[PDB]
């Protein structure tokens, strides 16, 4: 029952601009290059509009082939700032974000409706996290995985929706499972 992983996207091993598409273009999701604890650059996406009303900030990947996989796995590493560490008494601060996908045969889609995106889940910090010493503090780099299928189009677009969190997406790894090959 051991399956190999076929990696479709590994954002953390992209060097230079990820070039994902943010809606709005400014004042929502921003690409931010940071150094990890080993001084290795990571392209992150961040937003923290917690002094505003509830948000609707979208970020999407370009098209990802599914290579005729029935099911795809999406692993997100992320860090967030706790709402109880931020000002305001409007009750709008969240510690979650929303994950979506849009299956398409078209590898050059633009200006897509919100209602073409299918919600995968609300993503929250849970038990799975790496502890990273950031000076005197222990940062939780949270790891969450979800899967989708049965897939039926040539590929898909992933999207991330911020509704009012202080959130940084650090890694997006997308893969499917494949039986090991026979070594002729």
């Amino acid at each position: 029952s051991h399956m190999n992983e076929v990696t479709l996207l590994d954002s953390r091993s992209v060097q230079g601009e990820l070039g994902w598409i943010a809606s709005p273009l400014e004042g929502g999701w921003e690409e931010v290059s940071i150094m990890d604890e080993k001084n290795t650059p990571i392209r992150t996406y961040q937003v923290c509009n917690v002094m505003e009303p509830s948000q609707n900030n979208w970020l999407r990947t370009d098209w990802i082939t599914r290579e005729g996989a029935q099911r795809v796995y999406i692993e997100i590493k992320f860090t967030l700032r706790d709402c109880n560490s931020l000002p305001g008494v409007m009750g709008t601060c969240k510690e979650t974000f929303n994950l979506y996908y849009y299956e398409s045969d078209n590898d050059k889609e633009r200006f897509i409706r919100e209602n073409q995106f299918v919600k995968i889940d609300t993503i929250a910090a849970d038990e799975s996290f790496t502890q990273v010493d950031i000076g005197d503090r222990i940062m939780k780099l949270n790891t969450e995985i979800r899967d989708v299928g049965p897939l039926s189009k040539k590929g898909f677009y992933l999207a991330f929706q911020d509704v009012g969190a202080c959130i940084a997406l650090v890694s997006v790894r997308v893969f499917y499972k494949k039986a090991p090959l026979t070594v002729r």
């Binding site: 931010v32 940071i34 150094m35 990890d36 990571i42 992150t44 961040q46 923290c48 860090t79 700032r81 202080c166 940084a168």
Partner: peptide, 4 residues
């Protein structure tokens, strides 16, 4: 906001 996250500086690495």
């Amino acid at each position: 906001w996250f500086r690495g």
